[PDB]
């Protein structure tokens, strides 16, 4: 509930293959940033972690996915 | 990384080297991921029929 929906994080395939001198595009006192960020898996893993834990509960599995037979 | 060759050293030119990448052994695949992710080698013995 607290996490809410995981975000949709589309990936870009656009790349200009710029030359190294042109690439030395810097900030001093068709994207602004030539290079792009990655997903940040550590945060995305919270949905993955909870999904597995909830899945295991729903499928009557233990913490590691092993079966269990509780009374 | 999966090959046979003679060594490139100065005293290994007559040594026959064989090598295998662990990536191609498919060891991890043997057990489900849920059993744990840290899978490390403890001991290796060599048999040469």
């Amino acid at each position: 509930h607290l996490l809410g929906d995981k975000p949709y994080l589309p990936l870009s395939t656009t790349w200009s293959d710029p030359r190294l001198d042109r690439a030395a595009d810097i900030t001093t006192q068709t994207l602004t940033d030539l290079f792009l960020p990655q997903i940040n898996e550590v945060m995305m893993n919270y949905w993955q972690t909870l999904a597995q834990r909830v899945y295991n509960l729903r499928h009557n599995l233990s913490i590691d996915g092993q079966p269990l037979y509780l009374p | 990384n999966n090959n046979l060759a003679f060594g490139a050293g100065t005293d290994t030119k007559t040594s026959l080297q064989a090598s295998v990448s662990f990536a191609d052994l498919k060891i991890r695949e043997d057990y489900p991921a849920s059993l744990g992710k840290i899978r490390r080698i403890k001991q290796i013995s060599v048999t040469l029929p």
């Binding site: 929906d5 949709y8 589309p10 870009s12 729903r58 499928h59 009557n60 | -």
Partner: protein, 871 residues
């Protein structure tokens, strides 16, 4: 109101089933329905708005005969019953489409009714929210990865539609996932008849602009300019008439929010130019925010478990694009049959639906055409453009593309030519017509050879045995192709069953009666003539005495088998004219010298007669026919409803019938002669045959009752129900199907009387589906019933939950998804059915959850005068 009974405490119940009872009671309460059968069959089934118009009896019936390993092959092999059903009712089971879903998918999209259709299939949801992935993922229970693939809902991905002066297409934002539907209007302003201008989107403010000349001008260059100011497209040289050319260009809101004109300037090497133009507007409209095509695409891809990638390929390769309808669904159902029946790729299944090989690549997938012909890229591509008339005959040569075609089909050149003739028997010349139609058909003949255990040369031998010889694939309809394949599905499967090669069947089914004058047959003529030297036509009955001579002379047969062998040949006529045993004798004691090959032409006719006699004995032995069975098949075919006025034909289907009858007889065993005599006459009934066949008497009786009560392709007359093979075979099929299902034939009629594309349009009521579910379920073992129950409970809770959330849940409860429903009702619905519980245990769990949420202040306002209590 739950009682604290002992049973509520210690009877183990599957979970979910309790969640379903809760939802069913709340759902029943709303709309005040009498019971849960109305909830499941009348309410859920007709509710297109929500994740699904769930049909419980449909899923019950469907799953119950998927638990039955044949996958309806049990009926396909038993046509007396399968023919009572529209093939759609069989197809609707393997392809899991409920009749309501079918009816929804079969409706066409009319743009003028998009709002009316929207409000039929959707609740009162403004498209503004419906269209966004945040809503779609909840409405259709889809992942975002899946939502991202539902793009291009237009007539194309490439060259799109234009009508009534415009184009209606979706455009998707690459970061947001936001989809808007735009209309591009093109109104010509000048020379529409000299050159065309075609503007299509490819992204927001990104358009694919094509063009086509009608009138050729020898332009030094073409310049397409927006408002005749800013060049959008520049083509050097002089582009052609009726040829489409294009470029990807940028038009921002200043370029497209107002009507603007795209001018086509054909600039000559001189200072002059020719000019054509149209007024364009690109505008976002709520009026087009429907995409009901998406609703259908999603539901179809889910029902059939198909990727939307291949699904678009399947429907667009067979019919008019930008829509879903009955014809494309028929192709999907057929595609699924082949893919479910054979271990083949969906594209293969599509070709077997009389589809072309697709030259279009998409979604990082190389085209079918290139995968088949250019993977072996032998010093250049093969193109299928009509000019590469490569000689594919046997005795011929060609360039690397001949080698490519040989490799594409992986066959010899004589085989490729035979295959080419199978595609088109009139294409006897030294060439491929070089198009997709014939290549697709060459591919079909090869595919049929591979799915069936056949060679290429066997395709012709088999088509002759089947009765489909000289059939052109270049001229075969899809209905005809499917029919052909189905005949192979019952005939090649027959050969596989009987361990016969195609040639073996072919010779068994041959009526060629090759004639010659050699000892292999002449010795048989001399043996019979000499045996009959002390014989004449009016002294003794030739069909009595010749029979023991041929019995000894030919393939070790008895004299009764030999009698029938003579009658078969007399009726079949192994000669240029009629040829009978009497003629055979008349041509041996007249224009004949024993040991002589030559006299008159009747010397070849008597040879043909002997081979014909031998051919039936070959069949007798290969088919396992009993002596009396043979006597009746051949001399008394009338009670089979067969050739009747003649001995049975050499058609493979007749031989299949003969063999199946023979096994019926082999089973009758020791009582076979009593039954066969009674069969020749009308002395047969229920119990009597059941005893001989080791069947239950009532099982056989009820099969008779249904065999006669239902109309049949093999019509059954109660008078001869047990004394005619057409009728008996029909009865046995009702026995065999009921026995496999353990339902006692009245119980299989329950499955039969269900359909989709009923030709009489007698859409079955839920009660019919429910009655079938009941009887079919009753035939399951507990080892099967348990998985049925688990399956249905899981499907059912999903259906009840989506209904509840949209229609029952009160607004005060902030329930948006299944997870919230859980928290609100204090009971889960996403749990597997495998988890067992009790009623007391769930009541405890629900209350404990309620309390935990109150104590942790998940719920907003608990009563502190209660919270502080020591408990």
């Amino acid at each position: 109101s739950m009682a604290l009974s002992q049973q509520n405490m210690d009877i183990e119940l599957s979970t979910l089933s309790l969640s379903n009872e809760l939802l069913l009671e709340s759902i029943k309460t709303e709309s005040k329905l009498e019971n849960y059968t109305k909830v499941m069959e009348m309410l859920s089934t007709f509710r297109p708005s929500g994740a699904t118009p769930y049909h419980d009896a449909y899923e019950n019936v469907r799953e119950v005969i998927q638990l039955q390993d044949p996958g309806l092959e049990q009926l396909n092999a038993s046509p007396a019953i399968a023919g009572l059903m529209h093939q759609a009712s069989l197809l609707g089971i393997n392809a899991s489409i409920s009749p309501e879903l079918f009816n929804i998918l079969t409706e066409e999209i009319t743009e003028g009714n998009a709002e009316e259709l929207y409000k039929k299939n959707f609740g009162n949801i403004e498209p503004a929210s419906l269209a966004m992935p945040e809503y779609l993922k909840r409405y259709y229970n889809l992942s975002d990865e899946e939502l991202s693939q539902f793009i291009g809902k237009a007539s194309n991905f490439g060259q799109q539609e234009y009508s009534n002066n415009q184009l209606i297409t979706p455009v998707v934002n690459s970061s947001d996932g936001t989809v808007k539907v735009y209309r591009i209007t093109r109104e010509y302003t000048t020379n529409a008849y000299q050159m065309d201008v075609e503007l299509f989107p490819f992204g927001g403010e990104n358009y694919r602009l094509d063009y086509k000349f009608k009138n050729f001008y020898n332009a030094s260059y073409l310049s397409i300019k927006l408002n005749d100011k800013r060049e959008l497209v520049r083509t050097e040289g002089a582009p052609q008439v009726n040829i489409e050319y294009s470029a990807n260009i940028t038009l921002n809101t200043a370029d497209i929010s107002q009507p603007f004109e795209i001018g086509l300037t054909r600039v000559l090497p001189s200072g002059s130019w020719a000019y054509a133009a149209a007024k364009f507007t690109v505008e976002e409209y709520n009026q087009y925010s429907f995409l009901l095509k998406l609703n259908k695409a999603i539901r179809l891809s889910r029902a059939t478990e198909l990727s939307p990638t291949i699904l678009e390929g399947i429907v667009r390769s067979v019919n008019l694009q930008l829509d879903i309808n009955t014809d494309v669904l028929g192709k999907v159902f057929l595609t699924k049959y082949y893919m479910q029946r054979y271990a083949i790729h969906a594209e293969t299944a599509l070709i077997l639906c009389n589809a072309p090989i697709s030259q279009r690549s998409y979604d990082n997938q190389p085209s079918q055409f290139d995968r088949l012909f250019n993977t072996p890229l032998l010093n250049g591509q093969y193109f299928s453009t009509g000019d590469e008339e490569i000689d594919l005959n046997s005795g011929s040569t060609g360039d690397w593309r001949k080698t490519i075609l040989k490799r594409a089909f992986n066959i010899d050149d004589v085989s490729l030519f035979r295959l080419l003739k199978i595609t088109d028997h009139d294409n006897k010349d030294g060439k491929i017509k070089n198009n997709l139609k014939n290549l697709s058909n060459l591919y079909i003949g090869k595919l049929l050879a591979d799915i069936h255990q056949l060679t290429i040369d066997e395709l012709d031998l088999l088509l002759i045995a089947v009765g489909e010889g000289k059939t052109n694939l270049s001229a075969i309809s899809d209905k005809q192709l499917a029919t052909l394949i189905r005949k192979l599905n019952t005939i090649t499967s027959w050969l596989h069953t009987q361990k016969w090669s195609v040639f073996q069947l072919f010779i068994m089914t041959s009526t060629s009666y090759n004639k010659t004058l050699t000892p292999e047959i002449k010795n048989l003529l001399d043996t019979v003539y000499h045996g009959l030297q002390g014989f004449d036509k009016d002294k003794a009955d030739l069909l009595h005495v010749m029979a023991p001579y041929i019995a000894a002379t030919l393939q070790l047969s008895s004299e009764n088998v030999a009698h029938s062998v003579l009658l078969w040949a007399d009726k079949l006529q192994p000669g240029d004219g009629a040829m009978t045993a009497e003629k055979f004798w008349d041509w041996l004691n007249t224009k004949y010298t024993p040991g002589s090959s030559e006299a008159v032409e009747t010397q070849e006719h008597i040879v043909q007669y002997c081979q014909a006699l031998a051919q039936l004995e070959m069949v007798y032995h290969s088919t396992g026919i009993n002596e009396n069975a043979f006597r009746l098949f051949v001399t008394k075919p009338e009670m089979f409803g067969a050739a009747t006025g003649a001995a049975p034909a050499h058609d493979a289907l007749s031989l299949i019938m003969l063999t199946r009858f023979a096994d019926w007889v082999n089973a009758l065993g020791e009582k076979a002669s009593s039954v066969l005599a009674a069969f020749e006459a009308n002395s047969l009934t229920a119990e009597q045959l059941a005893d001989a066949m080791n069947l239950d008497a009532n099982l056989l009786l009820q099969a008779s009752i249904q065999a006669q009560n239902h109309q049949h392709l093999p019509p059954v007359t109660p008078e001869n129900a047990f004394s005619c093979w057409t009728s008996i075979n029909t009865i046995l099929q009702w026995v065999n199907v009921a026995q496999q299902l353990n339902v006692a034939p009245q119980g299989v009629s329950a499955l039969v009387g269900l359909d989709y594309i009923e030709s009489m349009k007698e859409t079955p009521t839920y009660a019919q589906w429910e009655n079938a579910a009941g009887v079919l379920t009753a035939g399951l073992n507990s080892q099967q019933a348990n998985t049925l129950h688990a399956f249905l409970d899981e499907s059912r809770s999903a259906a009840l939950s989506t209904y509840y959330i949209r229609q029952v849940a009160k607004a005060a409860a902030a329930i948006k998804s299944r997870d919230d429903l859980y928290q609100y009702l204090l009971i889960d619905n996403q749990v597997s059915a495998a988890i067992k519980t009790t009623r007391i245990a769930e009541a405890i769990a629900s209350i404990q959850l309620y309390v935990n949420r109150a104590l942790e202040n998940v719920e907003e306002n608990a009563n502190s005068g209660v919270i502080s209590r020591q408990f």
